[PDB]
A paper describes a structure:
Radial spokes (RS) transmit mechanochemical signals between the central pair (CP) and axonemal dynein arms to coordinate ciliary motility. In this work, we reconstitute a mouse RS head-neck complex and determine its near atomic resolution cryo-EM structures in both monomer and dimer forms. Our cryo-EM analysis on the reconstituted mouse RS head-neck complex revealed the presence of both monomer and dimer forms.
Furthermore, we conduced focused refinement on individual portions of the two maps, with the core region of the monomer reached 3.14 Å resolution, and the central bridge as well as the head regions of the dimer reached 3.36/3.46 Å resolution, respectively. In the monomer structure, the head portion consists of a compact body and two extending [name] arms, made up of two copies of [name]/[name]/[name], with the composition and conformation resembling that of the previous mouse RS head core structure. The [name] N-terminal Dpy-30 motif extends to attach underneath the head subunit [name] through rich H-bonds/salt-bridges and also clip the neck subunit [name]. The RS head-neck is as well connected with the arch bridge through an intense H-bond/salt-bridge interaction network between [name] and [name] and H-bond interactions between [name] and [name].
Residue numbers in the entry:
A (entry chain G): 206 to 261, 273 to 291
B (entry chain S): 206 to 261, 271 to 291, 310 to 377
C (entry chain A): 1 to 46
D (entry chain D): 285 to 330
E (entry chain G): 615 to 665
F (entry chain H): 1 to 113, 133 to 193, 212 to 276
G (entry chain B): 136 to 316
H (entry chain C): 229 to 277, 288 to 316
The structure:
Amino acid sequence: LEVAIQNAKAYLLSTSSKSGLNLYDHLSKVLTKILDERPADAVDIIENISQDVKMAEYEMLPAYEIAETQKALFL
Amino acid sequence: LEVAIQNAKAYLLSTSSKSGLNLYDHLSKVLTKILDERPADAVDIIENISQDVKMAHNEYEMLPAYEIAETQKALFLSLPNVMESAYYFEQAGVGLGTDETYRVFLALKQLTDTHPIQRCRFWGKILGLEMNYIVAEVEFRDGED
Amino acid sequence: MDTAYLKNCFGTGLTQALAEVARVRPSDPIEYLAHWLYHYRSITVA
Amino acid sequence: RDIEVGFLPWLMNEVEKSMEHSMVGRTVLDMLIRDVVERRINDYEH
Amino acid sequence: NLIPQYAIAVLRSNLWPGAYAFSNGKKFENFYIGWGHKYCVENYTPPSPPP
Amino acid sequence: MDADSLLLSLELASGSGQGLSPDRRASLLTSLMLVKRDYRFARVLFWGRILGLVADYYIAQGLSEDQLAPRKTLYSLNCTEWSLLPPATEEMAMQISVVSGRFMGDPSHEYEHQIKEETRLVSIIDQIDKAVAIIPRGALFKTPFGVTHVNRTFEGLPLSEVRKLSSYFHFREADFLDSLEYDIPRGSWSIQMERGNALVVLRSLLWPGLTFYHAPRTKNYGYIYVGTGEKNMDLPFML
Amino acid sequence: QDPPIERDLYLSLEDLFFGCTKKIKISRRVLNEDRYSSTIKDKILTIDVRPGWRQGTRITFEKEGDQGPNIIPADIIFIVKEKLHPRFRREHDNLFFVYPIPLGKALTCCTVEVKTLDDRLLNIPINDIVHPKYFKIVPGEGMPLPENPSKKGDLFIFFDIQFPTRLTPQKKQMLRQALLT
Amino acid sequence: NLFFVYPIPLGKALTCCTVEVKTLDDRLLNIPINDIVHPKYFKIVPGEGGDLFIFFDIQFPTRLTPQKKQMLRQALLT
Amino acid sequence: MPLPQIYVEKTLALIKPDVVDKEEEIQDIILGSGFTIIQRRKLHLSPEHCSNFYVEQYGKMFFPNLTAYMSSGPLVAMILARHKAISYWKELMGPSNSLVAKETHPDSLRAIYGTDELRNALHGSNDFAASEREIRFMFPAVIIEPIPIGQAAKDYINLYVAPTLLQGLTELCKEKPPDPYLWLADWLMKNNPNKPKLCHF
């Protein structure tokens, strides 16, 4: 029924204070990341896209340091 | 708009080859369990709702790699030393590396074991549009096949 | 009464089992019903 | 005798209500799909 | 072993794991890579304290 | 390690240096293609090498759809003829404890301490797989169907939690597996890096000879054990 | 009450491995209500074979036809016999494989190429000594249990040793050093 | 019909030799073996017992050496 | 059917065993035209499985040669979704009798990939109910629209399932075993009206 449509839309439109976003926009962004042409095995990764959209230098500088030490080998 | 709607739904009704479920029916069961019992934190329970939904003579296909694994079995079952030449190939930034030139050397060994060849050295490679060419110089002892 | 016994025994599990029986229609719905009863056992026990 | 008046019509009513809930979940998912596709069409082309 | 006419003899010390020596035999090279330990058939018994 | 890492020649680049030959690289590529053909495994990995006295042991393992299933390990000597090893029991595990000595080769060899050589190989394989097999964080996803699948959206391990040691699991029955911080004794893993931050090298010290490569930004992982075939109980004396 | 018929029907080993549906014709000795034809309206009965049944499971069509003055006939459509497979011969939850061998090759690290019912080329080595009364244990493969399709049975590999017959006495003279010493 | 089973080893099986099938009546004889023995094979000896029959049981060795094995391969697989 | 719902119809595309080795080119044709792949099954059609699949045609027409033809090799079955999938699949597929279809519809699939009547190039569903029956027989537990809401499914259970469920729940009350899911599952696998009795040994 259309009254059940409006009640379920109001239920999906209800926000949460612990996250600041509702279920409707979260599933809309999940479907936005789904509907680009991924290969058709997104059933296992429908969770991981929800953590990816829920989530959305100094640890790498040792590689820079050994690259500093390594450049004198051929110069 | 309706064609894109049906294409997006056919995207969502496509069955995965690993779990055997569709994304549309999984999200339908997730939304049904959400609309059945409604907690306050609707977003953060989407992990456990999707995990709880997941609780509830097909032939095997031969690859072409199976066929080339059939053909390359016999490689492992009067030549010059191809391997030092292949080591000297790589210093010029040239050649097949190690694996492809070793399969070349094994095919050279099979060719030398098949035909009475005095000198069977690797001539080189000719690049093609659909298939490669592996060329070997052959010098026969008696001049026959 | 036995009606309260069948009320408290399965309830929503048998409701969902007959819901997917009415939703997915196999060649034998009795075998699929028993298989989903076994699967509902394995869900509600573990 | 007791099942034909008791547990079985209540089971059919609960099965119809559960299929109503599954149908309303499917159509609000389809409404979400329609909103997503319409917003993507109106936004990516402009 | 597949093509034995151009093979090289690979020595392999079992007293020192990771220790190798090589042919053609006209020249040779020696190479070691391991944990720098001598293999024992039993476990490492500790050296006894002096009497 | 899969055949993809056999293509890149990553055993030598891990730094263990016992390594593999292009002989055995091409032989494992074609023969593990055969192993994936004849036995219907989901994935086939070259397990590694057991160091011999008259012949060299080459070991590979096959896995089913369940990633934590008991594997059907295989052995080969001339690197083409792969043959199925039997599964290991505990009765064969405590049988081979009275034999202390190097792996010889020629699998019909008999130990006077009878005890067959193949039983020693299989029990040693189950001991290494139960002890020092390695799976990183997020590489395996526990499906709610009861089976384990490869996580195909596995982003590689960031550089902050490479050195904890709480980001590496075991490839057996128990973030649902047991971590490396509960291994007995503590500090029994050689924590190392390659040139730059391009590869993380883990070497087992309870079994000297297993090396675990891990590129921190891509989905590249796997364990190869090439080494003596012995569990050193001398390891507390070493540290 | 007439006794039911017991038809011996043969199924192959791969059919019992996979569980294929079978279509079997039946007898036509049931009188209709119109008293003009003896053919039952259910000519072929739909069955479903589970993977890994026993040699002789009884499948009963209870109250089939329901025709007669005091006779309710039944049809035992399954007396599960098995065809002579050229490779495997089954047993209760087990398969034995009989594989021919030469005496100079039996003593080796053997190569037993086992082509199973799943079209899998199993390679099983023999590294123990080979008695005439010798068998091996290959767990994890066989026909599955009728209660558990997912978990499988056991393979036993038996050997038929053929002694050579055309040895000239030089190989007998040095076979005196090849077995006795 | 009187018959017995002799457990001949595999070393004396494939080689021509003499075997001692002693009868239970009159202490005879050292009948030699001429052909290569099969597991399903018998000889015929005249007499009374109803004639005597000999069945041969083959005893296999258990432990072998690699050189012993290779020279057995030159014995048998050639 | 109504405004806030949609009707994504389905059809079955069958790849005959003569043309299964050429599957990539015809797959390019069917994907490039607009039809989508839902799930592809590589199935060996048994002779005892082809008859139950073809009760609609083979059950009234005598044609055992096609039944032997479907068991001669592999068979690929796929589900298609498209706007006007039946009409566009009939237009791209063309009519049968490929000897005549080589001259009447030269751009059709049967004109290129087909040889004769019995050695057909493909097979497609004609009606929507026939499509539903074909999809429900070949493919696993997937949902085909419309969902029969209301009194349609209640009549299906009340004349297909619930007599057996009433007879099961009648014997389940007397006596009362603990954990009655065992008793209900054993009753349904034992007292099955559509499946015969099983006696293991």
